[model samples]
Target: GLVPRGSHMILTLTLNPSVDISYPLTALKLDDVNRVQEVSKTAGGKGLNVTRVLAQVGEPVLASGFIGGELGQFIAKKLDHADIKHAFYNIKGETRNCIAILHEGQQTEILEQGPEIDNQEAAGFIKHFEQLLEKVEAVAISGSLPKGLNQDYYAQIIERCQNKGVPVILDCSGATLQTVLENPYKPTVIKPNISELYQLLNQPLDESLESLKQAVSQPLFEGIEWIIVSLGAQGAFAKHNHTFYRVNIPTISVLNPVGSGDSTVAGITSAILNHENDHDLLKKANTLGMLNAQEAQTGYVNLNNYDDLFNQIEVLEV
Candidate 1:
């Protein structure tokens, strides 16, 4: 299966990127002994995963984000090794390192508060982003907001891209996401997990399949051009132009679920870039997520496995 390139070009912006460290342990104990057998580190961020998957699928992507200190430099090195084009803005504080401890039964994570960006540095990064937006067909703004940055960050990025006639996709959470959604700067596509959608809707969703079908037909999704609601193992629901599609999750072992959503975002963005506007986008996005989970490393999926999983995906219109 070959992808046909279209007029859609992509640019991904990550506000907070990190060096992710994972330690494998046999077991965890409060006061007992725990041996760390192996350690793995990778470029960690929502947009980083998106860029990696986009590049893997033969999509042209430019990743721009903030970095600082030695850890940030290490991430830059990794990006270069991956051959992913990126522009890093230096901040004052040291970049954060998130540690994941994989035990026999459970996984524990400890995330540090990322670096802070002053007004000047923030402005400088936005300016650079604006320049990049000029050539891109679409822009994707993903990941968590950096320390000391306001919710208006996404809104600012959305407005800038709109001015240049570039479609924007937003993947974020909490007040930061809501603040932007409230304003007029609605993104071209929004992929919110079921939990996040429930929070945004401020109510419990209907449980039955029939209820879901009726609920998806409401006017609440009118303003938003495309809405992707991910339902974990059940797969995802996508609504575009008042048409609904549900894609089933293919059977696959779960190696890691951390970067799966970002990989799905990459799949959807890359599909649109390849001129796939129909239900194929939804199926490919879900298949990409499954491919991402089956891999031990973050943001890297086997191409053959992806093609195999792509065929197993089930898509149906509601």
Candidate 2:
């Protein structure tokens, strides 16, 4: 085996990362009145957030992604300060700046199209990723697909890992996710929101447990081992084998939801890599989601607050 099959460390891939720019405004108007109260900048993108959260929780992780130019360097510096181990590929152009606007407890986003990676750069990234896979316990591929890449990129990566006996956790959207799901690369787990699932299943998802249970069974062609559906304030649904479980969310102050889903993925992947599979995966995921909502920034959680939040989660088998 290239790496120990059940190693303690996890490898995470964020194919597309961004320099997140956030603006806090008192009020927002199209062409009228908008005043910025505060401005903050940081590195974002799903895999980076996962690394940030996992590192905050004292988990072993290696984060890799496509990054380049000044913006990419800025992101690298942030990760360095956090003492998170990572390897970034240099692309042709500077990475993008994803904007987030916070006004009156509402959040709006403007996601920019990232750098267009050249063929040489893309191949180099693939090589770097394959090298990392040789020593990691598991690989988590999260976030969106970058420009100049095809939807089957995720499917190809997962298939490569499968040949090496490595499990993959895929989190993406649209054709990228659909193409992967259509292939035979059955990921170990997938975390899609209610909307994403609906898009795939093409049906209206109701609130009933039975309806959700039935919906979870859709689009699960062959090869998928577990399915996790995030229902926002309604908590989450987990289907493993033939059984289903729902973890209810407790009333908590939700400061923001910019990166809650990424945090949940980190929590679950870290829990699984630590060999704490006995219901702890769902519980910790639920707790992490709530924890992210409480924090001001994406990808950072208070470990001290976890114990209190853990006790608040209510898990039910349906």
Candidate 3:
């Protein structure tokens, strides 16, 4: 598959990347001992997930974030083995680890809050971001903030990217998303799930077309160009400036959906980098997720099916 991309790569950020560990068991034991033979560990985070998809699809992407300790080295080594380029900001504290236990058709997760970043630590990350921004064609800022850092941190990065003439695609929510939206510097694209959209609007919204259409039409979202609400099985409804479009995909069984949403963001960013039009952009975005969800591995896609699966998506204006 030929990805019509430019010379420069996209720079992706995950301020709080983690080492994800998963364990599987036949049944759960209440207060008793639980053991697992199959254990899997990988570098996991929103932006890194996006970086993996972009790499798989022939889009050059560089991953960067706060990384340190042995867990941090693990994240770096995983990227190295995958042959994905990265330049993370080193810190004194150990990066966090998220644990997921799968037992008897139930998935339980224990998530670490991640390392607390000081003002100087935050300054270091931004310095790396500033240097990398000069070399990339686009920027992707995703995921949560570490302790000792404010939501306004993302706003400063978005503002800087705008100042540098680089378009930013953000996948964040709650206060962080609110902070960026209120700032004069607007992100070029944001992909929020239905619930996140409602939370951003501070109102409830159904899955109806009219409901979705009005959701993106609100004044709080005024300056934003692309607001896409992912509808899971129903596909997506997106607003690009004044126009709205619906992206429909064939129903397929989803095996591992952990990083699928992140994959969609990567797909959209890659499409934008290649100058894909509205319809093709939406199609390419969903196509990657479909490939990722059908596989068991996180942050991966079956590249062999890209072209065929891409053709199945339908993007039309409403």
Candidate 4:
């Protein structure tokens, strides 16, 4: 194994990373240029979001995956500035940038489709990732697969991690997610929002807690240890083993809801690595998620009030 002896570090993978740019305006004009003030850029990707939140809470996380071009360099520099560790496999194609416009109390986003990764690039990443697996205790794989990659890419990665006895927490949807669920080597945990859950089951979107519990219990999800369904402001619903739980968080003004789910994943990964109990795990997950919602920045939280917020979360066994 590539992991150093006695090391239990966490690893995160984002196949399609972007420079997330945010612009604020009182109004967005049609067919006209709008002047913006205070543009903010962050290393944007679901996996990076998990990395940021994990590091903010004093967890050791190493970021990995495919990154390329100038934007890729920018993302690397930003990660370095944050003091987060990274080991990305670079590509020739340019990394993408996602633009978010905040206008009139609403957000409109313009997303870019990242570069297509070829077979050679994909194989290189897997080889690099295998080496990293030795050093990590748990792995978190998030976001979409870039173009030119197989839908079963995540499944392949999960299978490798499983062989090494490394726990994995997967947070992806669509075919990428389906491939993993249907495969024999199941992830240790999966965090899916209401819509993602419905997509996974091929059922209509259902937000009811009872419906969620039933869905998780289906044979398709067997072999999986944890199924966590995020319910936005209502907190989350989770099934561990055969027991179900309802997690609730105190309502606070939400500045930005984006990447909150990733924050939740970060919390769960941290707790799992620490071997926390079910009750504590759910509480910690919701608390980090709620804290991320309270911040204007995506995938960021102020840990100074962590204990106070953690105590406010209510986790009940159902």
The C-alpha local distance difference test score for the whole of candidate 2 amounts to: 0.81
Model 4 agreement with the true structure over 82-146: per-residue lDDT tens digits: 99999999987899999988889878999999898988998998999999988889999899899
The regions of model 3 sitting more than 4 angstroms off are 1-7
- Tens-digit per-residue lDDT, 5-94, candidate 1: 443568888888889998888777769776665789988888988999899988888888889899989998998998877877888878
Candidate 2 residue-wise lDDT, 124-214, digit = tens: 8878878877777788888878888766778778877888887777777777777888888778888888778877878876767888788
What ranking emerges by lDDT with the best candidate at the front? 4, 3, 2, 1
lDDT of each: 0.79, 0.81, 0.87, 0.89
Task: Report residue 294 deviation for candidate 4 (angstroms).
Answer: 1.5
> Candidate 4, which segments miss by more than 4 Å at Cα?
1-5, 204-210
TM-score of each: 0.89, 0.89, 0.94, 0.93
lDDT of 3 by residue, 160-203 (tens): 88897788899988888888888888999988898898888889
TM-score of 4: 0.93
Clashes of each: 0, 0, 0, 2
Worst 10 residues of 3 by lDDT: 1-10
lDDT of 3: 0.87
Q: What is the C-alpha RMSD of each candidate to the true structure, in Å?
A: 3.3, 3.4, 2.5, 2.7
Maximum-lDDT candidate = 4
